[PDB]
């Protein structure tokens, strides 16, 4: 059954499924966990970095797109580099041509359309990465979940990757609490650190293991690593 319709992305299955897209989604579940959450003033990304050996460095998960926008990756890092680079150019185009900060909602639409073109033509493959885009525009704080299928959803809180259901159940339960954390960045970080810890199983989050990013009302998108995330451990 499955063997005959998974040769390339262009082929539909008898049930109407796209297995190449489904296998690309499986690359996210194999990837490391990352958590996104927001309130009315700030938006926070918390990511768990993965190393190959104890002699290897921890691969970065968060990429800055603009002064008001950024995203965290789960899956293939080169595919995240391509999609983030495109989003960097789209933010750059809006600022140079229109003197306008790109809306986070419109940024999700642009990522949706670029991922879609890989699923309808022959020779192409779907992107093997899930992205969690945070940003602050003219309508406030935003959080968007990107999927290789093209589906982009605006959420208060979400988590993607391995064991990400534990973090997703936490945010769904703590929904009314972290939404009201306004004008206090540190407490929103702690809500995300407690969220990502619900996904832990192999090890505990350490100094060079944790990666946190924040963007808000009077806060540009900045990434904290190593010593800067030690106070949240």
């Amino acid at each position: 059954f499955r063997n005959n319709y998974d040769g390339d992305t262009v082929t539909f299955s008898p049930t109407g499924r796209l297995f190449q897209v489904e296998y690309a989604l499986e690359a996210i579940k194999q990837g490391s966990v990352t958590v996104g959450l927001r309130s009315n003033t700030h938006a926070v990304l918390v990511a768990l970095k993965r190393n190959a050996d104890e002699l290897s460095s921890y691969q970065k998960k968060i990429i800055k797109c603009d002064e008001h926008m950024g995203l965290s990756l789960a899956g293939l890092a080169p595919d995240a580099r391509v999609l983030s680079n495109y989003l960097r150019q789209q933010c750059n185009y809006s600022s140079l041509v229109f003197n306008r900060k790109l809306a986070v909602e419109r940024a999700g639409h642009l990522l949706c359309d670029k991922a879609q073109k890989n699923t309808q033509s022959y020779g192409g493959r779907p992107y093997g990465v899930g992205l969690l885009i945070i940003g602050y525009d003219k309508s406030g704080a935003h959080l968007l979940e990107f999927q290789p299928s093209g589906n982009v959803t605006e959420l208060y809180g979400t988590a993607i990757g391995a064991r990400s259901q534990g973090a997703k159940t936490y945010l769904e339960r703590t929904l009314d609490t972290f939404i009201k954390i306004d004008g206090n960045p540190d407490e929103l970080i702690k809500a995300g650190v407690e969220a990502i810890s619900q996904s832990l199983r192999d090890e505990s989050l350490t100094v060079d293991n944790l990666s946190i990013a924040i963007v808000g009302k009077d806060t540009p998108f900045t990434i904290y690593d190593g010593e800067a995330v030690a106070k949240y451990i």
Partner: protein, 233 residues
């Protein structure tokens, strides 16, 4: 490389305490022939911006079509098209300024001089100039063609610098504009008596006035003038 065929003369403008005033006459000149009299040269974009164009009319109609497409494009996938993510005067100008510079760089320019007048979302007055060369500049008073030589000196008597802006009311600012239109009708050979006037205010919004005429003209002194030197009768 081209030449202007159907032309529109001066577009004059100034900023007062609460907003901006822009005006242009209703003429479409064919060289020395004053061919068309029902030409609107002030293009309102939304309810917060008015775009005044001088020079080539065929190029003006192209710009007019581009502005209408910008409104249609901005409303696509945008639930806040009439609120937070509405078209600002700064976005409209920067788009035109990019187009005007790209066209001259391709050696095929839009033969125009454009002044974008409007009020930003925060309440700030917007008044910036762009021409066929792509040259951009802001000033308390802005005028194209003959208005730069004649209307600017008159309008600068009311507002000489940035500190004079909050001192000038709507009544005084409009009076200076109407007087400038009378002076331009006196000395510009490519001018019309009929003109349009637009007021963009942070409180009362956009007020578009049509079919305004130059009134209270001084001509009585002509009967006493006879000959060119020695003639007495």
């Amino acid at each position: 490389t081209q030449q202007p065929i159907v032309t529109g003369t001066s577009v004059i403008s100034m900023k007062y305490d609460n907003g901006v005033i822009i005006a242009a006459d209703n003429l479409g000149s064919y060289g020395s022939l004053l061919r068309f009299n029902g030409v609107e040269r002030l293009i309102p974009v939304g309810d917060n911006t008015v775009v005044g164009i001088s020079g080539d009319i065929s190029d003006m109609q192209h710009i007019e079509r581009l502005l209408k497409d910008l409104v249609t494009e901005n409303a696509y996938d945008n639930p806040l098209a009439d609120a937070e993510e509405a078209l600002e005067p700064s976005y409209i100008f920067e788009y035109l300024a990019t187009v005007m510079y790209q066209r001259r760089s391709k050696m095929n320019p839009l033969w125009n001089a454009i002044i974008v007048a409007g009020v930003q979302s925060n309440g700030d007055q917007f008044l910036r100039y762009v021409n066929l060369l792509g040259v951009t500049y802001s000033s308390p008073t802005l005028a194209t063609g003959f208005g730069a030589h004649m209307a600017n000196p008159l309008l600068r008597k009311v507002v000489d610098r940035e500190s004079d802006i909050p001192k000038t009311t709507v009544q005084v600012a409009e009076e200076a504009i109407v007087n400038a239109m009378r002076v331009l009708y006196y000395r510009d050979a490519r001018s019309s008596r009929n003109f349009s006037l637009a007021i963009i205010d942070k409180n009362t919004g956009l007020t578009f006035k049509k079919n305004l005429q130059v009134e209270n003209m001084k001509w009585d002194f002509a009967k006493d003038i006879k000959g060119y030197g020695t003639q007495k009768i």
